[PDB]
Enzyme design. Structure first.
Site: not given
Lengths: 204, 226, 245, 213, 201, 232, 219, 197, 201
Positions: I169, I1-2, I130
């Site tokens: 991720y 997740t960014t 993340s």
């Protein structure tokens, strides 16, 4: 444990016609000291004082709940409180918390308002009142404060011999306590007057 | 749950007004505080011989050094008995000492106040007369259903209480020993009471350095000899 | 629960007034005379005693005068029953102040705290209002010597001099004449109150037992409250006697 | 499970006089709330000039003493002479370290006279750290004994008072009364007292009565 | 426990408190924390007292075996490295020892630090103990390599006295040892409280 | 507890309770306020007698916030409850929103209390009506009055108390675009509105003014006599 | 803490010691233990000091009104049911160990209350830390309906054994005699320990204390 | 760990705080304002758990504004600290404990300047100087040496910079920018924000 | 997740990846992480997906109830504070939600952050998820408030593409949303890998 967080020491000795109470000025958190001006003795009214030790959170909190019951008791009564009456008041305040009990060991010293009679007493975390005919002490170093007052105490002592005895008991016993020190405030409760003195103590 | 006691157009309370008028017609009761003791002499009258005098007693102790008499309703008094005795209990729980008479009458008179406000309840129909002994000084107090408690050296309560007060106003003064306090309390009691006077008709009790104690019918008969 | 037994004390009059509140002040109007005077060097609160009997004890202190805290004091006019709860509640409120703020309560805060309780009972709850009017004296760090007056409706206001109970309007009329604002001190106000007490009281032969006088002043950084002994009041009677005739 | 240690109580005192050294401890041996016996002398005489106290877990007090006595003979047989008080102290420091991972639980106090005839008091810890001081204490009442000897023996916190070097007559009465006061407030101290005074002429033992409670 | 050392033009100054406590009770106020290794070489103590007394004497043993062997008067650098290697083999077994090594050699008055886990450092100013952070403040303020002999004593004196005031585990009497080319020398031993009375006035 | 319905309907739907509550509002003292350009001015008569009563405790001009003040006419006991509870909620708003409280956002809460407590079980309707005046973002003033029935409304000029209709007659006729154009005109108009209800008035008239981001300021009695000094 | 009692022919005597301790040290040497309930009914506490104190306070308070409401003598069995129901209400959270004995219309009776609430009737027992020392002495030498003097000599020696056989038991011995004719309190009846003296005295001369600040407030 | 410091001068109180607000391994907001204004002459410095720092301090902020508006005048410095301690002590035994460290800075027209130290256990003690965080160990020791009741604010600000430059040397966390303000009879006066190019 | 957002002269740009995975298995590649609250107001998602979907709709509920009440078009500051207070009551019960609120108001294109424990921040450039630390690097390099409209798209494009390359991720397609005074608008949706082929050449 929790009683060792703020440390502290309180000492009260009974003389002949008078009573003397003493406690140190130090306030610190574990290895971190805070201030030298901390006060472990609060006035209960004429010729009656109370010592407090242990966690300073409950020291200042119980002192307000004791002054809560003190003033209401003095405003309802037309006479001043006897030191024997105050002992049982602290017992009720600590026992009602039996599930959540406060952390402190109150020490009550003063003179019987009747004529001259001195009266002393001290309690525990569980709130058990106790009356002794010699002296009462409380704190983390209380094991150290016993031996001084055990041998030095006499059945009858004038204010000259009483102050000299309780002062030497404080200066010698507190120096061996790491969480205690930084000055000792001594209060002399006589029949005629009340004397307050600040002893010269090491800074350590 | 709505208050039954309200302010009249004149400002007085209507409900407590009949409460004071009720205790005014109760059983005659007198008391005297003289020297080191206080004498309490009340009226227990039985309508028939079948009545057992040992079963029911009007003079009841609150504690060792405190005792109380009454003129007024029977049932409301026993409610005062249980709550005042429980108040002395809860006193001894906290303070672990005998209760002073001033503090005992104060918080019991506050119970009389609670029913002049709380709804769905009538005020008490009993006027309490409290006797107490503390710190070597005798205590004689008088409380009515209104909740206001006073202090008296000697007073009268019940039927024809005005005469008993005026009689003690004339007869009673200072410097009377406990023996004279009993015989003066009997004389003022002879005036309010009518008919033959026996040890069963009157119930007498005293409070002194040894505490509040009720007199046995044997020693009462000795005082019936004048 | 029967709705016939409910008087509904929250009903407004056609003029927008409360009946139970107006009947409360009338019961206060029959109470004995109580007055107070705000002076430069102290506050003075004096009152009469309506109960007079040869067999009375009065081994306590004053009758209608109570002590709220170290720095404050109060008088009482009204039903002695409701006075005991208010005296307890005022002391509870003033002490609950000492809990959080740990300072002597300002004389303005203690008044508005009880008045919020008085109006709550007239607002709801169905319970009768309170029949007691109270005067307040004391000293604070901000405004200094203070004298206040309270009504059972919850309304209050500051006063330099006032009177409650019997002969209230008669004393107020004399306060509008003799009282000098910012001039007469506590000593001069003492002789003035005795003058007003003797003229407004139609009952003759004023004695130290029939009247009561209490003083509160701050000396050397400590609030000093005291009640004059009967001999000290008798000395003031000897002073006023010469002044009068 | 198995608890390797338990607190057996007791108290040990040592004071170094000018020409003398005094060491005293009680006879009370108790574990938990029960008394094993009222006579169990902890004081052990190593040499004529050295007396070692032992306060702590009793099982380690017995074994460690027998280990010291075994090394006393190793020295004397090798060096043809007795160990000095300072030599015994530094020896047990390495003895207590050999267990550093599973340390002996004990509080040792060594006292006696050195080659100069001056008293040498040596207080230890379970890990073996040591120091020389005029007077030391130990045991359950250790917190009680220290402040009294600071004022009386050490002359501390006293302004404008004559400081007289320690005398044997007073040193005896000070050691007696601090234990009389200890037996009052210490549940682990009392029932008897044994005082061992080491002087230049020799060791002299004493017995003092105490309360049986 | 408060121990500190710093090097400058005139050599190293080592200052330490005298107090070591166990729990809330003070074991001994008069404890001498500074370890004497060689005439010109000076050690310290931190953390566990027995761990220092044991291992610092092994270092003093190695330094003497060296001077008896090659007679080269072992440098401070070799002494600090040998002390760190001995703590590496037992790493993880629970040995906790701090220390600081001070002395002068052909390079200069070296100052080194040895941690419990084998950390070996070099720098101008070091301090250790429970009051080390209280020492860093006063020492850094008003410090330069050009400080004289007398000015540096005032810095080392105020370092311990003001640091032990804020620490419950630090106190006793101030023991300060200057370092020279010939060897270290005892400067002064003075109570912290006695110096507190002079600073308040 | 006490649980029953107090306010009940009538054959005509009117509420006798609420109507009698508004009668107590009419018998209150006269208070007025007017929206200026960047300023707002509040004022109230005071009925002090014989220099006896202190002037510190009489003040009916209260501030809900730095940018919001208010004045009330009615029972002085009910006002102290509403003002306190309004300030508790007004600052609780600043807890929820970093931006200050718009005058309309506090008015809707205040009048809502008069809605609930009127129809609530066992409660009592309030006998007060107050003018909540303040400055919104950009400096735009707002003036709002509550009702014991719980309704609220916006006003450019408004008055309460006895003779409130008479003051509005002055305001309705004399308030134009020329009115409240500058500071001198706003001050005079508010005073001239009170000059009709002057009865033994003198210094007794009290005034207050708030200007932009400046806090509420009270204009001392000496400058009152100076502004009343110019009637021509 | 050693508390015990014994029932004999003409009555019952409840023995206890005077010493109270807090976990490292003696709190008070003369501290009294046996409390008051009724003139003929007495009890003594053990275990937690404050819990045993406050429980007897609520017991003496409840029994006080029972004597005032009935106007008759109090039953010893009534006391025990009050004590255990409080222990049951808190589910053994109160560590109060209580022994109750006295004389009633029926006769001399001694009971026992465990902190968990269990109650047992019995002629003799002991409670506290030193209970096992007194129980063993009372078990061997007990006889049915002993003479008052014979029971006095035995129970005093039982407390003496409970003292000498316990670290938490010391001081004097407080025995309280309760008979059908009346109750009598004997304070410090036995003192087995003679050495109440000391070998030296400590006195201080005026001016030996380093006083810094001094002020006097008259009263 | 955030840092706080304060100094009580004879007529003044000098306080300073770090402006960095960081999360995980990064510093998200380096200009963050830790200083909260309780009253005109009364400021507040609150650090602690990231969630309890902003939430619990805003409760004190309005609770002080409650008193000032009700009675028309603000709390005194002594009255403010004692009321904040009971607020923190009441939630100590609740299910939402607050971890915070507060310094109360204020000036009074009579008693003058006042500085108050408060821990997360709500223990109030008056001190001439106090500090929070781990950086308090590297700073307060300097104050022990250079503090005198007669010191002038001109030298105090210079000594304050000497203490805060120690945070860039020994103290590990960066903390580039510090905010400094002073309290006196003339009110709040902002000082040059400490910047390290 | 960014997830990342930053404000400048022309307003805020929000860029996010599309991929959300559970364990080693990718749940869905096409997940749309950006939450649509109001026409001009734009939210994001971080951490737990269900916690964001639940609470961000409550924020959208509060923002709608406000505009229906006072019609004042609630500011970004009031929206960020109301979202933080709702996470304070349940603190400690296990709710984990990150998010960032973007929008323009009378003050300007405000950018705020709300953590799971109630942390509320304000600044020019934020990022979460993340891969937030991987976003901070590219975003800070070559960034000024004076960047134009076209130059800022290249910064936001390279921000996600290079950050999702280093994260297991983070991935999917790049969803970038510019913010304006009238409201936010969809700019481009492009696969990360398709842009990787243009950067390698």
């Amino acid at each position: 444990s929790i009683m060792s967080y703020n440390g502290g020491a309180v000492m009260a000795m009974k003389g002949k016609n008078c009573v003397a109470i003493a406690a140190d000025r130090r306030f610190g958190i574990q290895a971190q000291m805070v201030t030298t001006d901390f006060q472990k003795i609060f006035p209960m009214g004429d010729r009656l004082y109370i010592g407090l030790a242990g966690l300073a959170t409950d020291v200042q909190t119980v002192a307000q709940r004791l002054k809560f019951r003190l003033n209401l008791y003095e405003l309802k009564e037309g006479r001043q409180i006897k030191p024997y009456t105050l002992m049982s008041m602290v017992a009720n305040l600590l026992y009602e918390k039996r599930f959540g009990p406060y952390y402190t060991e109150p020490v009550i010293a003063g003179l019987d308002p009747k004529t001259f009679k001195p009266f002393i007493c001290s309690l525990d975390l569980i709130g058990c009142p106790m009356v002794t005919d010699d002296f009462v002490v409380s704190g983390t170093c209380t094991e150290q404060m016993y031996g001084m007052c055990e041998s030095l105490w006499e059945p009858n002592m004038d204010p000259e011999h009483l102050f000299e005895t309780i002062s030497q008991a404080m200066l010698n016993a507190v120096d061996r306590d790491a969480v205690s020190g930084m000055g000792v405030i001594v209060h002399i409760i006589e029949k005629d007057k009340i004397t307050t003195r600040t002893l010269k103590a090491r800074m350590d | 749950s709505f208050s039954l006691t309200t302010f009249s157009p004149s400002g007085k309370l209507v409900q407590i007004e009949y409460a004071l008028a009720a205790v005014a017609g109760g059983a005659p009761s007198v008391g005297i505080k003289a020297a080191n003791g206080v004498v309490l002499a009340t009226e227990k009258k039985q309508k028939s011989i079948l009545y057992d005098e040992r079963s029911v007693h009007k003079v009841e102790p609150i504690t060792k050094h405190i005792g109380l008499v009454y003129s007024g309703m029977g049932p409301d008094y026993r409610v005062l008995v249980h709550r005042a005795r429980k108040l002395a209990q809860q006193y001894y729980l906290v303070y672990q000492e005998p209760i002073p008479t001033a503090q005992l009458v104060q918080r019991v008179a506050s119970v009389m106040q609670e029913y002049t406000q709380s709804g769905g309840v009538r005020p008490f129909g009993v006027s309490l007369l409290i006797c107490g002994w503390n710190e070597g000084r005798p205590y004689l107090f008088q409380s009515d259903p209104s909740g206001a408690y006073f202090a008296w050296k000697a007073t009268a309560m019940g039927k024809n209480y005005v005469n008993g007060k005026t009689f003690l106003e004339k007869r009673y003064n200072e410097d009377l020993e406990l023996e004279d306090a009993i015989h003066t309390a009997i004389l003022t009691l002879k005036e309010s009471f009518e008919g033959q006077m026996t040890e069963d008709n009157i119930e007498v009790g005293i409070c002194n350095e040894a505490g509040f104690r009720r007199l046995t019918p044997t020693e009462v008969k000795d005082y019936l000899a004048a | 629960m029967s709705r016939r037994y409910d008087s509904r004390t929250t009903i407004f009059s056609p003029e927008g007034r409360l009946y139970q509140v107006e009947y409360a002040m009338e019961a206060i109007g029959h109470a004995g005379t109580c007055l107070g005077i705000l002076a430069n060097d102290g506050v003075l609160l004096a009152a009469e005693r309506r109960n007079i009997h040869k067999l009375l004890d009065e081994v306590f202190f004053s009758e209608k005068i109570y002590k709220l805290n170290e720095d404050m004091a109060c008088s009482v006019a009204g039903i002695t029953s409701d006075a005991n709860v208010l005296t307890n509640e005022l002391r509870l409120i003033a002490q609950r102040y000492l809990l959080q703020y740990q300072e002597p309560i300002p004389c303005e805060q203690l008044v508005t705290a009880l008045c919020d309780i008085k109006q709550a009972y007239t607002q709801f709850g169905g319970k009768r209002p309170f029949g007691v009017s109270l005067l307040y004296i004391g000293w604070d760090k901000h405004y200094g010597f203070q004298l206040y007056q309270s009504d059972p409706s919850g309304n209050y206001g500051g006063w330099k001099a006032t009177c409650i109970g019997n002969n209230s309007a008669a004393a107020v009329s004399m306060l509008k004449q003799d009282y000098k604002e910012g001039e007469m001190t506590l000593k001069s106000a003492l002789a003035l109150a005795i003058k007003v007490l003797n003229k407004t009281m139609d009952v003759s032969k004023l004695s130290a037992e029939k009247v009561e006088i209490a003083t509160l002043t701050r000396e050397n950084g400590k609030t000093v409250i005291r009640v004059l002994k009967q001999k000290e009041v008798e000395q003031l009677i000897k002073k006023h006697e010469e002044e009068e005739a | 499970r198995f608890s390797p240690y338990a607190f057996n109580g007791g108290t040990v005192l040592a004071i170094a006089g000018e020409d003398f050294s005094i060491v005293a401890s009680d006879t009370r041996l108790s574990e938990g709330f029960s008394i094993h016996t009222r006579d169990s002398p902890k004081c052990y005489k190593l040499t004529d000039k050295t007396v070692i106290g032992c306060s702590g877990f009793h099982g380690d007090c017995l074994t460690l003493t027998k280990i010291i006595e075994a090394r006393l003979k190793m020295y004397k047989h090798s060096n043809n002479k007795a160990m000095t008080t300072g030599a015994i102290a530094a020896m047990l420091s390495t003895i207590l370290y050999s267990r550093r991972f599973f340390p002996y639980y004990v509080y040792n106090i060594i006292g006696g006279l050195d080659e100069e005839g001056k008293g040498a008091v040596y207080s230890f810890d379970p890990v073996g750290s040591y120091q020389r001081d005029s007077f030391k204490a130990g045991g359950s009442a250790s917190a009680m004994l220290q402040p009294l000897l600071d004022n009386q023996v050490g002359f501390k916190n006293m302004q404008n008072v004559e400081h007289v070097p320690l005398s044997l007559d007073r040193a005896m009465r000070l050691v007696k009364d601090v234990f009389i006061s200890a037996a009052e407030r210490d549940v682990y101290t009392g029932d008897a007292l044994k005082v061992c005074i080491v002087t230049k002429e020799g060791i002299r033992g004493e017995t003092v009565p105490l309360r049986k409670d | 426990t408060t121990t500190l050392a710093f090097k400058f033009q005139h050599g190293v100054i080592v200052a330490v408190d005298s107090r070591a406590s166990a729990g809330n009770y003070i074991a001994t106020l008069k404890v001498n924390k500074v370890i004497e290794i060689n005439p010109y070489l000076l050690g310290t103590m931190s953390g566990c007292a027995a761990d220092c007394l044991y291992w610092e004497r092994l270092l003093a043993k190695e330094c003497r075996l060296y001077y008896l062997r090659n007679g080269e008067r072992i440098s401070v650098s070799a002494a600090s490295k040998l002390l760190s290697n001995m703590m590496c083999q037992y790493r993880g077994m629970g040995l906790s020892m701090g220390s600081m090594i001070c002395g002068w050699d052909k390079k200069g008055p070296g100052l080194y630090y040895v941690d419990e886990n084998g950390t070996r450092l070099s720098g101008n100013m070091f301090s250790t103990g429970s009051g080390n952070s209280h020492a860093y403040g006063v020492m850094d303020s008003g410090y330069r390599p050009d400080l004289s002999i007398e000015e540096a004593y005032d810095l080392g004196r105020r370092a311990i006295v003001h640091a032990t005031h804020r620490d419950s585990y630090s106190g006793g009497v101030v023991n300060m040892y200057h370092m020279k080319e010939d060897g270290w020398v005892k400067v002064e031993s003075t109570d912290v409280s006695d110096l507190m009375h002079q600073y308040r006035e | 507890s006490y649980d029953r319905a107090i306010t009940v309907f009538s054959p005509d739907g009117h509420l006798f309770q609420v109507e009698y509550a508004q009668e107590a509002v009419k018998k209150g003292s006269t208070a007025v306020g007017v929206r200026g350009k960047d300023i707002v001015v509040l004022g109230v008569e005071k009925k002090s007698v014989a220099k006896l009563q202190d002037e510190r405790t009489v003040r009916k001009i209260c501030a809900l916030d730095d940018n919001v003040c208010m004045a009330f006419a009615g029972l002085t006991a009910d006002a102290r409850i509403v003002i306190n509870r309004a300030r508790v909620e007004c600052q609780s708003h600043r807890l929820t929103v970093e931006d200050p409280v718009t005058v309309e956002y506090i008015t809707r809460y205040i009048a809502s209390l008069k809605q609930r407590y009127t129809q609530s079980n066992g409660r009592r309707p309030f006998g007060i009506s107050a003018l909540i005046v303040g400055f919104d973002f950009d400096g735009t003033p707002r003036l709002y009055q509550t009702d014991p029935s719980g309704t609220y409304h916006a006003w450019k000029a408004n008055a309460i108390g006895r003779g409130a209709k008479s003051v509005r007659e002055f305001l309705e006729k004399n308030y134009t675009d020329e009115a409240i154009e500058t500071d001198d005109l706003t001050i005079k108009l508010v005073i001239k509105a009170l000059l009709e209800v002057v009865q033994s008035g003198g210094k007794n008239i009290e005034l207050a003014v708030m200007r932009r981001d400046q806090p509420l300021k009270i204009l001392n009695p000496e400058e009152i006599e100076k502004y009343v000094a110019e009637i021509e | 803490t050693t508390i015990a009692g014994l029932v004999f022919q003409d009555g019952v005597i409840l023995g206890a010691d005077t010493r109270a301790t807090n976990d490292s040290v003696v709190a008070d040497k003369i501290c009294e233990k046996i409390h008051f309930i009724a003139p003929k009914i007495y009890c003594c506490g053990a275990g937690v000091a404050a819990d045993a104190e406050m429980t007897t306070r609520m017991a003496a308070s409840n029994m006080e009104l029972h004597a005032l409401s009935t106007g008759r003598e109090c039953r010893v069995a009534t006391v025990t049911r009050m004590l255990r129901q409080t222990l049951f209400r808190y589910q053994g959270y109160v560590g109060a160990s209580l022994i109750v004995g006295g004389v009633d219309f029926t006769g001399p009776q001694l009971y026992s209350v465990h902190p968990h609430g269990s109650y047992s009737r019995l002629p003799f027992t002991a409670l506290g830390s030193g209970q096992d020392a007194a129980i063993a002495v009372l078990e061997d030498r007990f006889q049915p309906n002993m003479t008052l003097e014979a029971a006095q000599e035995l129970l005093v020696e039982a407390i003496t054994a409970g003292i000498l056989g316990d670290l938490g038991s010391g001081g004097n011995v407080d025995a309280c005699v309760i008979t059908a004719a009346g109750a009598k309190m004997l304070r410090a009846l036995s003192s087995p320990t003679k050495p109440i003296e000391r070998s030296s005295q400590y006195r201080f001369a005026p001016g030996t204390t380093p006083v810094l600040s001094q002020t006097v407030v008259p009263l | 760990m955030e840092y706080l410091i304060g100094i009580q001068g004879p007529d003044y109180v000098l306080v300073a705080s770090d402006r960095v607000a960081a999360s995980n391994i990064v510093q998200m907001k380096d200009d963050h304002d830790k200083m909260f204004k309780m009253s005109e002459k009364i400021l507040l410095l609150c650090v602690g758990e990231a969630g309890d720092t902003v939430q619990f301090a805003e409760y004190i902020q309005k609770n002080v504004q409650l008193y000032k508006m009700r009675n028309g005048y603000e709390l005194s410095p002594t009255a403010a600290a004692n009321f904040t301690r009971r607020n923190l002590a009441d939630y100590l035994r609740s299910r939402t404990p607050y971890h915070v460290n507060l310094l109360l800075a204020g000036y009074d027209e009579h008693e003058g300047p006042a500085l108050y130290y408060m821990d997360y256990l709500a223990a109030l003690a008056k001190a001439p100087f106090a500090a929070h965080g781990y950086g308090a160990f590297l700073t307060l020791s300097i104050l022990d040496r250079y503090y005198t009741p007669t010191i002038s604010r001109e030298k105090a600000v210079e000594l304050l910079r000497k203490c805060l430059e120690e945070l860039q040397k020994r103290f590990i966390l960066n903390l580039p920018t510090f905010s400094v303000r002073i309290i006196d009879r003339n009110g709040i006066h902002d000082l040059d924000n400490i910047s390290f190019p």
